[PDB]
Amino acid sequence: MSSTPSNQNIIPIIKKESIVSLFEKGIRQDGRKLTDYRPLSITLDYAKKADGSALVKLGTTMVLAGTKLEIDKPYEDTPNQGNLIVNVELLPLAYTTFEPGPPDENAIELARVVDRSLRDSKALDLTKLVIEPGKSVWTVWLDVYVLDYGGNVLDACTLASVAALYNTKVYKVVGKLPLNYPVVTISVAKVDKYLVVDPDLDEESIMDAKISFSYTPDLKIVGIQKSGKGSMSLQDIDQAENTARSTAVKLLEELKKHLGI
Amino acid sequence: MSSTPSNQNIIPIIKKESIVSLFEKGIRQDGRKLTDYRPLSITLDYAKKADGSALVKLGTTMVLAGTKLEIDKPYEDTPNQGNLIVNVELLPLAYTTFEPGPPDENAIELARVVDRSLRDSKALDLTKLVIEPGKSVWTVWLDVYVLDYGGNVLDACTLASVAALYNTKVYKVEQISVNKNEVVGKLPLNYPVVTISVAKVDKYLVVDPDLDEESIMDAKISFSYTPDLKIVGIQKSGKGSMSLQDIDQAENTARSTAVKLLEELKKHLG
Amino acid sequence: MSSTPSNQNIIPIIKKESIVSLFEKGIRQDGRKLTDYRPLSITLDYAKKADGSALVKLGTTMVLAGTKLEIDKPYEDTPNQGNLIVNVELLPPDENAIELARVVDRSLRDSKALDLTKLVIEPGKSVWTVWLDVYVLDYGGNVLDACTLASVAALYNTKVYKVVGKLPLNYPVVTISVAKVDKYLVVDPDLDEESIMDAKISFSYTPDLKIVGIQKSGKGSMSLQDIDQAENTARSTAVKLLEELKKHLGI
Amino acid sequence: PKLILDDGKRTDGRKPDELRSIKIELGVLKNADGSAIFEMGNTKAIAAVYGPKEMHPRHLSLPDRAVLRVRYHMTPFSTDERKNPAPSRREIELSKVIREALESAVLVELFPRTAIDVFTEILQADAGSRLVSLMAASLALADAGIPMRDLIAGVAVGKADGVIILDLNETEDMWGEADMPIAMMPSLNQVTLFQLNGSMTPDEFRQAFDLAVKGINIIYNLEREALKSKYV
Amino acid sequence: LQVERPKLILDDGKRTDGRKPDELRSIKIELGVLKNADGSAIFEMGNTKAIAAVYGPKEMHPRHLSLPDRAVLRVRYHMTPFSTDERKNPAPSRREIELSKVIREALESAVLVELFPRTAIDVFTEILQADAGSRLVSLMAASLALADAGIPMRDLIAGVAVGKADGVIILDLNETEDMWGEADMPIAMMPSLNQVTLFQLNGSMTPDEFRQAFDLAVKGINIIYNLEREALKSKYV
Amino acid sequence: ERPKLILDDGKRTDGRKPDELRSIKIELGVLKNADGSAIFEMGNTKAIAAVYGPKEMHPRHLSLPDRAVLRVRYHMTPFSTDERKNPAPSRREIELSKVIREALESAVLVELFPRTAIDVFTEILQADAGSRLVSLMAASLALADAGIPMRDLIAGVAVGKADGVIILDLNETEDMWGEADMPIAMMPSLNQVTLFQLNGSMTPDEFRQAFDLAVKGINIIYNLEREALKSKYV
Amino acid sequence: QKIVLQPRSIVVPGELLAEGEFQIPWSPYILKINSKYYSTVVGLFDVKDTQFEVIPLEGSFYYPKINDIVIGLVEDVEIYGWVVDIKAPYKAYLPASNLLGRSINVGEDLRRYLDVGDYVIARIENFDRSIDPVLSVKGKDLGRVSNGIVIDIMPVKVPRVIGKNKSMYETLTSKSGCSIFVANNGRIWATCPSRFSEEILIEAIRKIENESHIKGLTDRIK
Amino acid sequence: KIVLQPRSIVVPGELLAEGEFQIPWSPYILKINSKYYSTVVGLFDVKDFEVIPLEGSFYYPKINDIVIGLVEDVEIYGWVVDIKAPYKAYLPASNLLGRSINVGEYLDVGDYVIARIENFDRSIDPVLSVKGKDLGRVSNGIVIDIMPVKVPRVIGKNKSMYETLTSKSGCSIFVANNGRIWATEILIEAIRKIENESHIKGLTDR
């Protein structure tokens, strides 16, 4: 069943003993500060057969998200909304140890966390996707494909997700999606006694835990997810959201610049 | 998974040798020449609860295919046509390393190769198969069950597939729902289709390869023919490769055999 | 595929021989007779969001069953009756779960204990579907009997809606399992008894003491006489079991 | 439907104590340590055995006896309506019931840490499949020379219009009152498979019990001789 | 969500089930209910009910799935088909696969797994009645079952879901609140060590509302933690 | 309705002559956590391959005593087609993964790494007929980009038949509405055919004509492959 | 009590052989419950002196008895030896040190002495209940096989192919075309010259399998 | 007998020379009958012909080589070591000590080790020995991973580069056959520049 992962990513001791000495002076191994996000690239309309797509390079993490729209029935559960279906996959190509087949647990979590931060944020207004009430409705299939696991894949997933939705052109061409505003997810990792923003692969293999905070432009908290074997203090969570929110200002702006605002 | 098969049963490093010198002299170990098929047999209506069926015994390969017709919706992807669904299963029963469950890879390949050769030859049409357009249609389920893996299973699958479709008795739609007592008539069949597999073993081309020959071959190529000797499907199989001339000549040897095969098939069904 | 169970947990050869000596005086380790059932308990309306539920404690076997009613369409095969679907789950579907579900369903369905024809709202159109989910929370041996006691109890506890009232239930059904251990027949075998037994056979009875379901289980075999006698012991016990069940159901 | 016509004969012209026609054929598959085909009127089954071999995962094996791996599977064209080839709830049940039947006959103690595989396909179904499947299995194991206490012979005894009957046909299974599959090791008089589906009185139970045993002994002779057409 | 109501905080500062914004639902705990289980517990929060079973440290079935220095936790979260209002398919959903992971990781920091290398500790939970807070009720039942199994742990795990209904910060959400409210923030922790074990938010809150709800959960957790310690205590000597 | 595939001058729907290839784009080393990687474009068909170089097999009884095990996968993203495709591996994807593996089985020198596994994974980001070949070629280049010894690069084209007209490198319109579709792949320097399939219908003579047209289309792609790997910095 | 019910009959599983007590040793082919004796296999009931037994007419698997001489097939080359198929329920293992006569040196087996696919003649040096069969290639004419053809048979007809007082040995070792080494394994190793009047002798070892029950056989062979 | 190229860039399948040469066995050259082909993206050369691989991120073990490995697992009888190979290496506990184990649970999961491949062939995984000079547990600096192909390139060419990397920054960087150098500021960088600019000569610089 849901088991402790078996194998595993063995980070060297000396590459962990020295990573902490770098933190002591407020700098990380790639050169960036404890609060710095990795370099962000967004290529809209990469997948040409998708209704809307984004290829996000965040550090060495590469994520591709594509949208596919269809006309379906609204469920027995409110017939005054469209549909949003998020499918995240870690391909046997992204990381050495990864295997083929159905979504895995991390894959399902990534999908579910991105789904919630899109749906509950009212980032995408589903009520406007109704063609005729209780009858025909737009179904938004969002498929997120992680192509290179370089750490902090949740944040890269959200960036590609929002970007793909903004790049989506609806047909029968009519217009873009009924999107209210962009949403960003900021992950803060508790490494030793340090809080670190946008952790990479090595940092993810040495961290106690990580917590992810999702923000709308009004700097309103719209999603929280804690991950990892380890635990955090109340003061760690309190401070992690402070660190997360200050970064959300910067991140929403570089996101807009890339999304053509 | 799609991995290199981790089972060979290990063919003896010396068995391969004896089959290679029995060659050259241009003969095999079951006494046939390099262009001969194994003894064939087809039993129509073997499985009495199928709409149509055939038990094919090709050498020591044994295959059984049955048909089952049902009235369904078509797709709104083109809807003046009926359906063909092919399911081949290499049964745990047929060989020691076979295990039960979902169709395997070889199973799926055999099913798809047979499906293409029936659908693209237009041998089964269709024709037809509409009872009323965009509303109701015949769905043909063809289930091909390999009972004994004796080598060259693809060709045996095709013979049983075609023979079973020819054995199919259709029934009356009467408003709506089917019946039984009123057997309407046969399937919309334009013509029979045969598949001939030629295996490259060492430096020789070998028609209808058996199990021992399949275990030592570099690769095999399968040619599908209609009665007008028109090529209607090709599939290459195996770890190894063939030269352009190997394929060129493989198709010549396959076509000469297609004439012999189509007439033995016809005797078995009219 | 369907393989001989690999995880065995091993039975001490000295333990079995002490259990056999207690049989030799017609008593068991828990103190009961060779024909006695274990202490039974039935708590109706345990799972509150079920249409009807029953928490059954039989010895150290615990079984919970809940019902859920929906309006579906009757199948092509006879549209003049409702639906019963039984799903059993061992909670530590496996093979035993599927078997248990299938044996519970047959003895409920064939006994005509729950009349399906009366579940029709309008013929060939809308019909009542009864979902029966049985959840074995503690495998203490003789789970089949505890599954049937839970199922019937939950059906009798079920309230239908537009609240209207109970299901079209004709009568209760019990199942009695008789294990052949060494050279003895044992009623309501517990965990240790199931681990040392050759085989068990289960008999389902309606209030006639009429046989309405039989199932044999286990690696080993029984003689013809063993079966003949096992049903005779099973039937005598059915009288005792039906009346304790009715007391629990409020008749 | 009327099942026992007013004259004392069945829908297919049989007396209440008569068996359907039977055909048994040994060694039909070449790549199979043992095989057999079993016909019981309109029910057709084929079994294959792959002799004691090594277990694939080590921990799924037993330190002191062989593991039996039995399969019951119905072809998609063996029924009147197309049957889904993916194993149904019925097939999973019957695979276990047939395995447990054979667990008491196959001398598993002789091959510890190994696996014996027995696979059966139903090419035609018409009630009795589970017994035909089991009898095909038994004979296939013998066609492989795997030591066994005794062959397993079996019939489904039953009840139609109050009339206790031997070897049910399809009409009898789906419209009769009771259906009682019984299989046993006839020479050791040990019952190997026993199920009831429907309804019977304690007296009717014991009457049909006796009818099955004599129906069993007839099929048992047909099994022994079928394996004896070696040449004797 | 409809777009203006139904009423969540009523007409005097009282909720749809009669609670003040800072009141817990009724709690019922019962230990060692299953006899063929190394540890077991039933947990009830208002209308939410869960039962957990533990199978003490044991050998792993396939070798390579085990860890050389610590125990493997095998945790399952499942809802019975009759625990919801509409019959729920008993095949594991995407919701159940996610929660099983989230509950496992919660327990990963409490259970002293370094004590039993190369072993497996199994923890199975069933939701018998669902009315919001199930993931937390399930996790607490797991914690209590583990204690009922005598498996060493750093501390028990107590948890509550704080939230927001009509701009009002509320403690321990019911089904109506989870469905029609603005926020749902499950928090669980090890109260004696002041270490957060599980932390999720679904919906929307302001940075300040976050910290006020954060405070309300901590005092709600301290009450639940007291009830847990004393539930295990009865065995009075 | 079936469109006219061949005008009316001997040109195609897209504008090509019967013997012209679509535009080819190749890019090496696009992924960072992968021993080898490549992107291959054939007109509108786009594919990405990653290789994970020789490594230890997870279960011992799935490895081979004398050679490496190839693990090859063909998979289409849900947004590669016009109608969304279910990401679960279809029957088409299971067939092509086997056919692509076996094509690589005669090129990859597996005898050099007994008891190991070589993993190759391909993703189709855009489909427009030829996907299985574009997949296979991306795979071939990725293995080279990883330094795993191979007999020869694999180049491939789908040769076919449209309006009685034998054509080279079919587009989507041509695969869907034409008479024949024949994907051929080979190791061009060793003159050994590695993948050979036909879907549709052809006369024995049209078979040998297309055969020849494929070989010269292959040799063109072969040089585009060679030079793409050869853009050293010389 | 002591009655035998059969003369020299073809016997099936579950068939009654005898009543009461005899002094027979344990056999896999005969099961005794209390006082009745039954056949467990489809075989041949034979009575000799006070004793009786069942020669099995079927059996494609080989069952190991210590110090038997089998011809096996190298499936896997281990670090400290070879894994070998000997038609048993269990795969055999030939130690490397047994073959070399010494421990393996630092950089030896590519395969060299035996490879995946090589035939081997070896004796079962050690076997039982707790272990899988261990082999030895030490005796005369043991070790790797380097030509001829290997003929597989049902291991249960091995005694019949050699015949009574090793006589079906030399009636087949001398119309041909030997040495025909009938291994206890159900595998014989033939070494005919021979091109290509041939040792389709192979069909004669087939005719033995078809009629082991028919007598006297050793003369019907011609 | 004829050779086709001086020393150009060579691709897999590219014809090198034809006929009767001999010519020992290389994994980078395949010869069927008379024709010789390159099997890798490499560099053609001759002397007394050969292909020097320009690509290859794995290390192929040769007996006697000195590698820097990473301990992945600790067994009851020894240690499992990663050495960038298709095969995992094994360091016997006996070799590390003085020849036996009082059964006790010593370096752990993630410790870098310098060792020599004592034994290796086609039927075994590489066996390591920690006996010789400077061989042991690495406890400091950093391990820079590079393509096992560029090992000889990081040095020269008459030991030239080795003195140039050292006469600008830090100290005794050890170039193991493994494609891994143990350093003792940052250099990742220039060994990432000679790492990627390797194709272009004459070497260097700065």
Numbering used by the authors:
A (entry chain D): 1 to 172, 183 to 271
B (entry chain G): 1 to 270
C (entry chain A): 1 to 92, 103 to 172, 183 to 271
D (entry chain B): 7 to 238
E (entry chain E): 2 to 238
F (entry chain H): 5 to 238
G (entry chain C): 7 to 228
H (entry chain I): 8 to 55, 58 to 114, 119 to 197, 205 to 226
Describing publication, verbatim:
To further understand the RNA recruitment mechanism of the exosome family of macromolecular machines, we determined the crystal structure of the archaeal Sulfolobus solfataricus exosome. We observed that while the catalytic ring of the S. solfataricus exosome adopts a three-fold symmetric structure, its RNA-binding ring displays considerable rigid body and thermal motions, which broke its internal symmetry. The three copies of Rrp41/Rrp42 heterodimers within the catalytic ring align extremely well with their counterparts in the previous structure, even though the three-fold NCS was not enforced in our structure, the three heterodimers does not deviate notably from their symmetric positions. In addition to rigid body shifts, we observed conformational heterogeneity among Rrp4 subunits. While two of the three copies (Chain C and I) overlap reasonably well with their counterparts in the previous structure, with the r.m.s.d of the Cα alignment at 0.5 Å and 0.6 Å, respectively, and at 0.8 Å with each other, the third Rrp4 copy (Chain F) adopts a significantly different conformation (the r.m.s.d. of 250 Cα alignment is 1.5 Å with the previously published structure). The conformational changes are not due to changes in the crystal packing environment, as minimal crystal contacts were observed around the Rrp4 ring. The exceptionally large geometric deviation in Chain F is due to a rigid body hinge motion at the linker region between the N-terminal domain and the S1/KH domains, because when aligned separately, each domain agrees well with their counterparts in other two Rrp4 subunits (r.m.s.d. of Cα alignments for the N-ter, S1, and KH domains are at 0.3 Å (50 aa), 0.3 Å (70 aa), and 0.7 Å (115 aa), respectively, Fig. 3b–d). The hinge motion causes the S1 and KH domains in chain F to move away from the central channel and thus increases the diameter of the pore opening. Although Chain C and Chain I of Rrp4 adopt very similar conformations, Chain I displays considerably higher thermal motion than Chain C, manifested by a higher average temperature factor of 81 versus 61, as well as wider thermal ellipsoids in Chain I.
